[PDB]
Design a protein around this ligand. Structure first.
Ligand code: CLA
Ligand code: CLA
Ligand code: CLA
Ligand code: CLA
Ligand code: CLA
Ligand code: CLA
Ligand code: CLA
Ligand SMILES: CCCCCCCCCCCCCCCC(=O)OC[C@H](COP(=O)(O)OC[C@@H](O)CO)OC(=O)CCCCCCCCCCCCCCC
Ligand SMILES: CC1=C(/C=C/C(C)=C/C=C/C(C)=C/C=C/C=C(C)/C=C/C=C(C)/C=C/C2=C(C)CCCC2(C)C)C(C)(C)CCC1
Ligand SMILES: CC1=C(/C=C/C(C)=C/C=C/C(C)=C/C=C/C=C(C)/C=C/C=C(C)/C=C/C2=C(C)CCCC2(C)C)C(C)(C)CCC1
Ligand SMILES: CC1=C(C/C=C(\C)CCC[C@H](C)CCC[C@H](C)CCCC(C)C)C(=O)c2ccccc2C1=O
Ligand code: SF4
Lengths: 135, 742, 30, 466, 31
């Protein structure tokens, strides 16, 4: 499903280790208007192609970091995918196609506490219970 | 394009307004203080000109003006040293009796009993004995009276004035444009040919016409008053002919290539003058003449305005091979668009040069009555090693600052810099390994030896009398350098240094220099040096190579050069910044150089320095205990630190008492540093909260809210007091010891 | 000093708290 | 050809046979000129009062050892033999000079290959037979030259001997193989072939060398190179040059060692005292020859490496523009392709190690690894242990070794026990037949047996060094 | 009885550590 040619000068010792084969791997795709030089997540000046680029990355933070650099190149169409050893590619960023800093209807509040941080219980109150003070 | 003088006129109007506006230079600081962090940030950012303005031209002008400022303060200092020589010294007494009189150029005022520090230094003079070697410098210069020092001091104050004016003028009044600054080919030409070449030719002039004659007469035992003034050797040729017959020939032999006619005042003697135990002035003369010619030739390499010459960009671009992709392409842009890239280079290589100077000056003492002044010898070696080590770490810092701030991917794609970034894991992993290998097979041998000696098994030790580790290569090189005169250096009489071999040379009763034999203790300590240098490089190289990113922090360049961490996540990211690698490299630089100056101190005192019997038997200062003692840590603790600290700890109620106070004071400052290094900001901010509560309670709470130092400042203050305390301790130790035994 | 026998008795007596220390340690792990 | 600049101008006629030939005859002429002219140069300034070694005459010593115009006590009485030799070369130079300039530009650029007699001299770098025959042809002349020295040593006067300091004739040459080849195996001294202490072994050596070279001469002209040679060696014209440079470098170091330590074949009356000696400030002829040919051997080793690495790069299908450092076909992978980690030599070597070698059982892998590690681990324990300077040094060392190997056997058992946990295979670059618990037990059993054996074998060799 | 030192000190030095580290290693890696 992941289309895009690997950028030129993409090679370095900072690339994928055995984790990429055994645990999980990430990909970041983006469409460039023009072939241009960009710093790789783990060092080395790579060259983007005009059109679809595919870069495999060890960590999602590499994708978000590179994403931030692509924004400085006026590129906001970058998609990060998590890839499992079974070849189960999962589109993970942006989750719902809209960037998380922009508000999108349909998203529900997760881990919201309807109180000020000062109104948390004391650790003594939740002692020998399953719950924590921030629950 | 053509190198030319192009300046803006009246770029910055001179006014005290901004003197009354602390932090004017930074937009953030300009708003004013809200917390005490502001006061630190003011000083921290003061000379960080890249953060003042984006304009490279304005930065270049600030740097050029600041340099005139630093030249002015260094000239004020050098003028002060010479003035203190002219007014408050026993220089003239020391000239009359170099071997007996002790150099002193600092007299203390009689107040709170500190006049005790004005000890009997000889020449009916009371003052602090100086270890800077200024007297040996001035004797080498051919200065024979206080008036010549007064003239030189005043001349210096005028030059310092000129340097101040220059800095004001070249910033406020006629500031060069960026075009001017980026003439690297013209700058190299002028700095090779005029600064170094004409400076060396000029100095050859002074040596040949003033120093060599005056020193030759002083070595012939002629009274200082009886010696003619330096201008009398020019005005009265007959006096100069009598010392150097070659001057009879005049200047025609120079122009007709009959240079052998100057063989008497331009020599290749080698070794040392037996009277003074310093290098021959005639050798030094020929050196500076030969240097001058090579420099004046060298500085016609780079193309300026006449087509002839190299462009450095084309040289760099052409040097590429099958391992290095584009090779040195793009490095010209790095070194001509980044001041940090130039400062990195210049600090790394000036630092490396200062350490070479340290080594070359002890082994080949260039000044008269330096070699036998064991206090001066130890102190100038140690001093220049320290300056060297700090400059090298500065090189690494500014290399990392360049990588974070001024590194461009576009300029540096598939070049040597780009390709080192791409195998930085392979570089650091291998350097990590060689550090552990050297650590085990250098330090582990000391631990082996300590344990064997402790278990009553000296036969099982790594020693000359047990399992030998002879430095055969260094031993072989010493031999080659000893056989050089007459052989592979036919026109040399003696070796370059008696350290390599030849005889014991002695001046007065004392050894100037003798062969420095290398054995198991010298093999072990050399592999300790290799270890401690490789670990410092591991830290600093890791700092520069991982400044922009790592497998842990991909966007480290965005966090900047100097940030404390990226939080307790990822297991904890404390001290990942390039700044924090410099911080850690300073401790290892300190650890490394400490063992270098300790090595030098003990080896020279045990195996080189000492008295010489009429028969010719050498009685060393610590009686050659290095070979058997310096192969265990216990031997270093006992026979070096414990043994030689006796003078500094027993100095109270004497002229050396100050070193006893400095010794404790420095131990204190060092220990104080551990408060900053071992603790964290969080604790101190919470303590300040309670103290601020009490000030609030009595309505003395300051408007500038007190804050605990930044995480980075905590570390900066830590390493500052640690280095100050540690280095100052050894300084007090070395002085008190060597001013007693040496 | 004490006899070789006394040393051997002490070692055999020391197996008793050795055994009971094991039993307590295993019981404390549960 | 035209891609090479003037600086690398001699590389233009690698594939052109005529120019390459003409260059070799021309350089031969240059060596002959020097040999001949410098012989006369040395004759012109020979003072018979002063010794040769501290005059700076290099060739006259080489003519002196052959026994050309010497009386008793190594005294040069007549110098006509030096002149006749000097002129013979010096004229031979002018004949070879002529031959050089002809074949250079006047002759054909390519030597033609055909069934006629001129066709024979023509060659191609790919046709391996023709080079093998050329190797044998010039080997017959090396043999001939060795037999000419023997004929000089036996029939035509003899050679100078430093034992009696006279020019004795040799009658009984040492035709014993055990004695002459013993020098190669370091039998008669630590110095090896440079430990010769009599002319009887020197003449005997050059008989054996003579017959071997002639024997190899007939072999190579009458045989083509077999399939095993066809795979292991490179067959470009620059590959042969790199091999010849490796030989020259070896020979240069050999002679540099000879002149340094040997005094029989380099008499002290001509060359000077052994080692590096300087008499009255003047550097001896021995020191000059020793140190020069040592430095030239280091240079010619640098020449072998350069020309050999260039061949290996070109034959791998790599250019010097893109270079020898690449990515793993998937650039975003960690490692880079380098000649350290991806070279065919490296890959062939690693694959063929017992841990990776196909067709080895788990036990056989362990056994071979065991034997190797167990063998070398004895050394340190025996020679640096606490009992190293006692009668129990070897036995102590053996028990230590067995000891360490038993802890390493436990380490293997622990490693296996940790990983083999019902189905879940161990991570890391394992062979396919070490990914089961029973295979790992066999591997550990192999290691134990191998390592104990390897140690025991080293001990039997160490204790029976007699 | 002094001979017991020649038995116990090596056991506490080698046998007990190996046995303890072997077991604890196999325990901490048990899944
Ligand atoms: C660059 C560094 C330098 C340093 C560290 C010193 C240090 C010193 N100078 Mg020197 N001096 C220098 C440059 C320097 N000087 C220069 C360039 C000149 C030429 C103008 C002098 C001319 C000079 C004189 C004439 C005297 C000193 C004196 C002193 C000593 C006392 C300082 C003092 O009077 O405080 C006073 C406090 C203030 C000025 C601030 C209130 C002190 C050791 C004094 C001394 O050695 O007394 C025995 C003294 O009389 N200096
Ligand atoms: C005495 C104090 C001390 C010691 C021993 C160490 C040791 C080490 N430092 Mg550290 N360091 C120190 C102070 C010390 N440091 C301080 C105060 C700082 C703050 C500035 C640092 C900051 C620092 C940095 C920034 C770095 C190091 C690194 C290292 C390692 C260098 C590699 C090496 O030599 O391995 C060999 C090991 C030794 C020399 C230790 C002693 C070995 C003994 C003698 C042999 C073993 C005996 C025996 C088998 C013990 C086990 C048996 C027992 C269980 C029965 C080494 C482990 C570097 C590193 O990790 O690179 C490889 C590195 O980059 N250190
Ligand atoms: C030392 C002995 C030596 C000998 C015998 C030769 C012989 C030859 N050289 Mg070489 N050459 C030499 C040293 C030598 N060279 C050196 C030291 C340099 C560096 C200056 C060169 C640089 C050089 C160039 C640039 C060329 C030759 C060429 C030739 C060939 C001439 C063919 C022609 O005329 O066109 C001939 C085989 C020519 C050639 O290779 O033709 C195919 C040719 O173009 N030579
Ligand atoms: C560059 C200049 C140069 C010069 C002037 C010499 C000169 C000499 N060489 Mg050296 N040689 C050289 C380069 C040079 N060589 C190089 C680059 C190598 C490869 C590293 C050698 C390898 C070599 C060996 C192995 C030997 C010499 C020997 C000699 C000496 C006798 C030559 C002889 O009789 O040939 C022999 C002639 C034939 C076999 C006829 C066919 C003579 C002084 C010989 C000697 O005795 O030196 C100690 C000797 O055994 N040379
Ligand atoms: C670090 C310390 C160290 C020490 C003290 C030794 C000591 C020894 N080695 Mg060992 N070795 C070492 C490290 C060490 N080695 C390492 C790191 C390797 C690489 C794996 C080797 C690989 C090696 C091999 C292949 C051999 C030795 C052999 C020897 C023995 C030579 C004795 C001899 O001259 O017999 C006379 C010579 C022979 C019997 C040669 C037989 C062929 C000696 C006991 C030799 C040996 O084991 O002797 C039986 C031997 O063949 N070593
Ligand atoms: C760290 C360095 C170091 C070194 C080099 C030594 C060396 C030595 N120790 Mg000492 N020792 C040390 C630290 C060191 N010690 C420390 C920190 C302590 C604790 C305080 C001791 C306490 C100690 C005691 C109590 C004793 C020794 C003894 C010894 C000697 C024998 C040890 C032995 O047999 O091991 C055998 C070693 C090996 C089996 C390992 C060899 C490593 C090989 C050579 C590496 C090869 C790698 C290869 C080159 C690369 C790949 C090759 C390629 C072809 C693939 C030996 C001279 C003994 C002695 O009698 O003294 C004379 C002894 O009784 N040591
Ligand atoms: C805590 C208890 C302990 C004890 C009892 C020992 C005992 C010994 N050590 Mg020390 N050692 C220890 C801890 C200990 N070690 C630690 C923690 C270190 C790291 C700091 C060392 C580092 C060290 C070094 C570097 C060396 C020793 C050596 C020795 C031996 C020296 C005696 C000798 O000269 O005869 C000679 C004795 C022998 C040659 C070995 C005898 C047979 C061995 C012990 C076992 C035989 C196999 C066994 C039956 C089964 C497998 C082994 C194991 C699982 C039990 C002795 C066996 C030296 C030695 O000889 O090493 C082998 C030596 O070089 N030790
Ligand atoms: C060391 C010899 C050396 O530097 O080799 C030289 C070699 C570079 O060869 P090149 O011919 O490509 O160099 C061309 C330019 O970089 C020089 O102008 O370096 C490497 O291969 C990388 C360094 C590996 C070093 C590993 C340690
Ligand atoms: C110490 C000091 C000082 C002083 C100094 C001085 C005094 C200096 C001077 C200097 C000098 C005084 C220098 C000079 C130099 C010169 C030169 C460098 C020259 C050159 C020349 C030439 C180059 C030539 C050329 C020519 C001609 C012209 C013609 C013919 C040919 C010829 C080529 C020969 C002061 C006060 C600052 C202070 C601080 C310290
Ligand atoms: C230089 C080089 C190299 C080499 C080196 C080395 C590695 C060395 C070492 C060596 C070695 C390391 C060797 C070894 C050997 C071994 C042996 C030789 C063994 C033997 C054994 C045996 C024979 C045994 C037997 C037995 C058993 C098994 C069991 C039972 C008992 C018995 C005894 C029967 C390489 C290739 C890397 C690479 C390239 C370069
Ligand atoms: C002690 C300590 C502090 C506390 C130290 C502080 C806050 C420094 C304050 C000291 C200065 C000297 C206060 C100066 C105040 C006035 C300027 C003095 C005015 C009076 C003079 C004119 C005499 C930290 O903040 C800290 C932070 C991070 C890591 C470690 C540490 C740490 O170890
Ligand atoms: S302890 Fe300090 S440096 Fe480390 S992560 Fe926390 S705040 Fe950052």
């Amino acid at each position: 499903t992941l289309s895009g040619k690997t950028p030129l000068f993409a090679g370095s010792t900072g690339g994928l280790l055995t984790k990429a084969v055994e645990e999980e791997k990430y990909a970041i795709t983006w469409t460039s208007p023009k072939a241009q030089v960009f710093e790789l997540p783990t060092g080395g000046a790579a060259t983007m192609h005009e059109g679809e680029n595919l870069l495999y990355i060890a960590r999602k933070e590499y994708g978000i970091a590179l994403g931030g650099q692509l924004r400085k190149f006026k590129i906001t169409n970058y998609k990060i995918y998590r890839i499992l050893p079974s070849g189960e590619t999962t589109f993970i960023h942006p989750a719902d196609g809209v960037f998380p800093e922009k508000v999108n209807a349909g998203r529900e509040k997760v881990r919201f506490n309807a109180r000020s941080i000062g109104e948390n219980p004391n650790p003594s109150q939740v002692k020998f219970s399953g719950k924590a003070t921030y629950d | 394009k053509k190198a030319r003088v192009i300046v803006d006129k009246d770029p910055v109007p001179t006014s005290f307004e901004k003197w009354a506006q602390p932090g004017h230079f930074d937009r953030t600081l300009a708003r004013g203080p809200k917390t005490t962090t502001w006061i630190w940030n003011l000083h921290a950012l003061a000379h960080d000109f890249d953060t003042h303005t984006s304009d490279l031209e304005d930065i270049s002008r600030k740097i050029f003006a600041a340099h005139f400022g630093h030249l002015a303060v260094v000239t004020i200092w050098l003028s002060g040293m010479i003035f203190h020589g002219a007014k408050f010294s026993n220089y003239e007494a020391w000239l009359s009796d170099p071997l007996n009189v002790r150099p002193s150029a600092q007299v203390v005022w009689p107040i709170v009993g500190q006049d005790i520090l004005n000890g009997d230094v000889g020449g009916g003079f009371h003052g602090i004995q100086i270890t800077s070697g200024l007297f040996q410098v001035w004797r080498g210069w051919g200065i024979t009276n206080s008036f010549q020092l007064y003239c030189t001091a005043i001349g210096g104050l005028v030059l310092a004035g000129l340097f101040l004016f220059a800095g004001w003028f070249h910033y406020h009044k006629r500031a060069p444009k960026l075009e001017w600054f980026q003439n690297v080919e013209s700058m190299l030409n002028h700095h090779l040919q005029v600064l170094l070449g004409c400076g060396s030719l000029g100095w050859a002039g002074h040596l040949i016409h003033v120093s060599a004659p005056i020193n030759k007469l002083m070595d012939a035992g002629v009274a200082v008053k009886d010696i003619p003034l330096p201008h009398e050797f020019i005005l009265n040729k007959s006096l100069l002919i009598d010392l150097f017959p070659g001057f009879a020939a005049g200047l025609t032999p120079f122009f007709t290539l009959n240079w052998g006619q100057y063989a008497d005042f331009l020599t290749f003697k080698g070794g040392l003058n037996p009277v003074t135990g310093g290098l021959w002035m005639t050798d030094i003369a020929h050196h500076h003449l030969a240097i001058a010619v090579v420099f004046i030739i060298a500085g016609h390499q780079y193309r300026t305005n006449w087509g002839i010459g190299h462009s450095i960009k084309e040289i760099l671009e052409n040097h590429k091979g099958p391992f290095t992709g584009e090779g040195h392409k793009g490095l010209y842009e790095n070194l001509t668009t980044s001041w940090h890239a130039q400062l990195a280079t210049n600090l790394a290589f000036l630092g490396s040069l200062t350490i070479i100077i340290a080594h070359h000056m002890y082994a080949m003492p260039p000044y008269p009555y330096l070699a036998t002044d064991y206090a001066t010898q130890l102190c100038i070696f140690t001093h220049h090693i320290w300056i060297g080590g700090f400059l090298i770490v500065g090189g690494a810092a500014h290399a990392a600052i360049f990588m974070v701030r001024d590194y461009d991917p576009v300029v540096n794609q598939n070049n040597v810099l780009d390709r080192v970034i791409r195998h930085r894991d392979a570089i650091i992993s291998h350097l990590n390994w060689v550090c552990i290998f050297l650590g085990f097979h250098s330090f582990g041998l000391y631990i082996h030896n300590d344990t064997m000696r402790a278990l009553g098994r000296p036969q099982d030790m790594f020693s000359d009398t047990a399992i030998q580790l002879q430095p055969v290569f260094a031993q072989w090189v010493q031999n080659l350098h000893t056989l050089a005169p007459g052989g592979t250096a036919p026109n040399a009489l003696e070796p370059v240094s008696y350290a390599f071999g030849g005889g014991v040379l002695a001046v007065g009763g004392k050894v100037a220099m003798m062969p420095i034999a290398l054995g198991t203790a010298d093999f072990l300590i050399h592999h300790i040096h290799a270890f401690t240098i490789h670990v410092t490089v591991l830290i600093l190289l890791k700092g520069v190579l991982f400044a922009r990113s790592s497998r842990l922090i991909p966007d480290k360049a965005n966090l900047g050069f100097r940030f404390p961490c990226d939080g307790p996540g990822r297991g904890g990211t404390c001290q990942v910044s390039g700044w924090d690698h410099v911080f850690l490299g300073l401790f290892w630089m300190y650890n490394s150089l400490s063992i270098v100056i300790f090595h030098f101190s003990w080896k020279m005192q045990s195996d080189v320095w000492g008295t010489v019997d009429a028969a010719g038997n050498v009685s060393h200062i610590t009686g050659g205990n290095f070979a058997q003692s310096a192969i265990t840590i216990n031997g270093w603790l006992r026979d070096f630190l414990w043994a030689q600290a006796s003078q500094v700890i027993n100095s109270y109620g004497s002229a050396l008492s100050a070193y006893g106070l400095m010794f404790l004071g420095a131990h204190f400052v060092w220990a104080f540093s551990l408060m900053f290094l071992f603790s964290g900001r969080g604790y101190w901010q919470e303590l300040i909260e309670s103290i601020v509560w009490a000030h609030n309670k009595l309505k003395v709470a300051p408007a500038i809210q007190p804050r605990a130092l930044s995480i980075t400042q905590g570390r900066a203050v830590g390493v500052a007091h640690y280095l100050l305390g540690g280095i100052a301790t050894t300084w007090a130790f070395f002085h008190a010891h060597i001013l007693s035994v040496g | 000093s004490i006899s070789d026998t006394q040393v051997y008795i002490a070692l055999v007596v020391a197996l008793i708290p050795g055994l009971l220390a094991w039993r307590l340690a295993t019981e404390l792990y549960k | 050809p035209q891609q090479y600049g003037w600086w690398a101008g001699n590389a233009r006629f690698i594939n052109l046979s005529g120019r390459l030939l003409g260059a070799h005859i021309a350089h031969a002429g240059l060596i002959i000129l020097w040999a001949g002219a410098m012989t006369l140069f040395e004759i012109t300034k020979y003072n018979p009062s002063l010794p040769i070694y501290e005059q700076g005459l290099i060739l006259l010593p080489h003519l002196a050892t052959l026994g050309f115009g010497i009386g008793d006590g190594g005294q040069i009485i007549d110098t006509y033999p030096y002149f006749v030799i000097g002129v013979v070369h010096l004229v031979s130079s002018a004949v070879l000079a002529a031959g050089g300039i002809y074949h250079a530009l006047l002759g054909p650029e390519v030597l033609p290959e055909n069934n006629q007699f001129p066709g024979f001299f023509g060659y191609d770098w790919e046709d391996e037979d023709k080079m093998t025959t050329i190797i044998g042809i010039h080997l017959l002349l090396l043999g001939a030259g060795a037999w000419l020295l023997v004929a000089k040593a036996l029939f035509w006067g003899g050679l100078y001997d430093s034992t009696v300091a006279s020019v004795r004739v040799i009658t009984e040459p040492t035709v014993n193989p055990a004695r002459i080849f013993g020098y190669l195996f370091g039998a008669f001294g630590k110095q090896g072939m440079a430990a010769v202490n009599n002319l009887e072994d020197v003449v005997g050596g050059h008989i054996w060398v003579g017959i071997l070279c002639i024997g190899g001469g007939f072999w190579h002209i009458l045989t083509q190179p077999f399939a095993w040679a066809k795979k292991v060696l490179f067959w470009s014209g620059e590959a042969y040059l790199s091999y010849s440079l490796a030989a020259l470098a070896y020979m240069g170091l050999l002679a540099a060692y000879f002149v340094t330590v040997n005094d029989t074949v380099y008499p002290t009356e001509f060359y000077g005292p052994l080692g590096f000696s300087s008499t009255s400030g003047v550097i001896s002829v021995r020191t000059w020859l020793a140190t020069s040919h040592f430095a030239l051997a280091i240079v010619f080793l640098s020449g072998h490496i350069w020309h050999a690495l260039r061949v290996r790069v070109l034959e791998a299908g790599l250019n010097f523009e893109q270079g020898v450092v690449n990515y793993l076909d998937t650039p975003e992978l960690g490692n880079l392709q380098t000649p350290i980690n991806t070279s065919d030599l490296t890959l062939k070597f690693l694959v063929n190690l017992p841990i990776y070698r196909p067709g080895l059982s788990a036990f056989a892998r362990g056994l071979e690894i065991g034997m190797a590690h167990g063998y070398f681990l004895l050394g340190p324990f025996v020679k640096l242990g606490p009992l190293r300077n006692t009668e129990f040094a070897n036995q102590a060392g053996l028990l230590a070794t067995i000891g360490l190997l038993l802890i390493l056997s436990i380490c293997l058992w622990l490693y296996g026990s940790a990983w083999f946990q019902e189905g879940k295979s161990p991570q890391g670059e394992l062979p396919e037949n070490l990914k089961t618990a029973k295979s790992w037990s066999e591997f550990n059993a192999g290691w134990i047996v191998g390592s104990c054996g390897g140690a025991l074998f080293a001990y039997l060799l160490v204790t029976n060094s007699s | 009885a002094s001979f017991l030192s020649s038995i116990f000190v090596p056991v506490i030095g080698w046998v007990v550590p190996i046995a303890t580290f072997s077991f604890l290693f196999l325990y901490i890696e048990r899944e």
